[PDB]
Amino acid sequence: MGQKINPHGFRLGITTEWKSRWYADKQYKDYVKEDVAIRKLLATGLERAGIADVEIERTRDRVRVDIHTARPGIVIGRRGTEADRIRADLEKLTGKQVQLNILEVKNPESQAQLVAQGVAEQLSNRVAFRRAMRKAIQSAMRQPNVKGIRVQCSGRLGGAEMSRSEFYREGRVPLHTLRADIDYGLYEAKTTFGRIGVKVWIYKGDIVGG
Amino acid sequence: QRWLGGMLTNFSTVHKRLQRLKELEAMEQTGGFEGRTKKEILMLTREKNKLERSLGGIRDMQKVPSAVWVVDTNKEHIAVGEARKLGIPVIAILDTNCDPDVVDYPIPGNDDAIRSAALLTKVIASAVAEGLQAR
């Protein structure tokens, strides 16, 4: 319908960096398999925690798993108790040893992934969806330094039978411009009536910064 | 040059064009011309060209005025209806084909002659300067 390519996959050569970074000849399928099982292992407890980014640098078979989140304090509970448990399970599930770096984003409401987190987690929690979005925004519109936003919500909105898509915005979000620095995040709400897939575009600025 | 529809009733939008015109002239005293692409420089030459050639008085206004002086109530009908709508009194020149009920404090006369019209402009401009002297 809207045949819109994932813009983090449309600027992954130009502005947005890769999330996983190594070099691999004849070891690549194994590094893919470990990358997948690591991201499944970091889905659940960190999606409780407020995860945004999961980068995996990979040096000579050590591993370096780095996570950008919005609360160092739920990811790091008691020191080593909440960190070294998921870290140690990453050390056992992989056949390797894990150096887990955990870091905070300076503003959670201007990460598109974290905006999709807070919006969809509100939308599972029986709030008004036009109020959620509309408050998804107002906040982020701001606050830093953030020249667009565009929120779309499809699915059983309000528990209705029809799957109505909604489309709210403010400012400038140019997708066809490649010097855009757009963050994109889709996260999917889980109501009892079903799943409300939320897409958030956030246009930070014109800046190439090449 | 041309009466833009909605200057008085809509001041909150046409004031933004003025601050953009200030940022344009303040980036003309800056001197950034060669560092940008010349299509953007000629485009800002069109923005300063049209926006300065068509907007000269509200450059000094800023302040949603208390009185409006109108030449030719017939042709500039938009200014007289907008000026009536806010409650601002209307001072005008009225030929034989102008409705005097829309103008509170008129000065009747021909507007087609540059001597007569321009002389009445001298009347009320000297009147405003006479207001400025004792203030």
Partner: protein, 198 residues
């Protein structure tokens, strides 16, 4: 208009002066056919006013319901309208017409209550009246009966204004019962006002 009860840890709800009385009369989704389907928008007929007897009439167009209500609030805010009274009644029987809206607004003795249909009941409950007797003849609508009621309140005038138009010393303009009601209403204005000063 749902999910309004909320507590926010944000900057401000911006509650401030002019706590006026605001009534939303009707909302009908307004559709528009375009190429490939229908575009639903929303109209909210907003009545605002204070209990002195100043009335607004606003008409909100937006594709969200509280957005249309807020735009009707700002539009009636832009356009107020003074209604003359006697005590908390109306002066004299009028009929207003807004092109099909007929409304008869007749005064009554106090204590009777605002008897009117829901649009006229809205415009008169926001206003400074407490005891009048209206009826909405014709047009069976909300917009035309609100706008017809406001035209009916434009056909109102003071007893004093009438005396002034005719250059006659009051007494000589009213009859006497209504002058006595002026004495009653200004007397209770004096009692509640001087209880307001202390």
């Amino acid at each position: 208009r749902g999910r309004r009860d909320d507590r926010g840890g944000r900057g401000r709800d911006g509650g401030d002066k002019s706590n006026y009385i605001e009534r939303v009369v009707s909302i009908n989704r307004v559709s528009k056919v375009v190429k490939g389907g229908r575009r639903f928008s929303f109209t909210a007929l907003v009545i605002v006013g204070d209990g002195k007897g100043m009335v607004g009439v606003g008409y909100g167009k937006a594709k969200e319901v509280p957005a249309a209500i807020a735009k009707g609030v700002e539009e009636a805010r832009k356009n107020f309208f003074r209604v003359p009274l006697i005590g908390s009644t109306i002066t004299h029987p009028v009929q207003g017409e807004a092109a099909a809206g007929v409304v008869m607004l007749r005064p009554a003795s106090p204590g009777t209550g605002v008897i009117a249909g829901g649009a006229a009941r809205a415009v008169l409950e926001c206003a400074g009246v407490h005891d009048i007797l209206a009826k909405s003849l014709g047009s069976d609508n909300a917009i035309n009966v609100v706008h017809a009621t406001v035209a009916a309140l434009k056909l109102l005038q003071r007893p004093e204004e009438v005396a002034a138009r005719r250059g006659l010393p009051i007494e000589d303009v009213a009859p006497a019962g209504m002058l006595k009601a002026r004495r009653e209403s200004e007397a209770l204005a004096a009692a509640a006002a001087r209880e307001g000063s202390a």
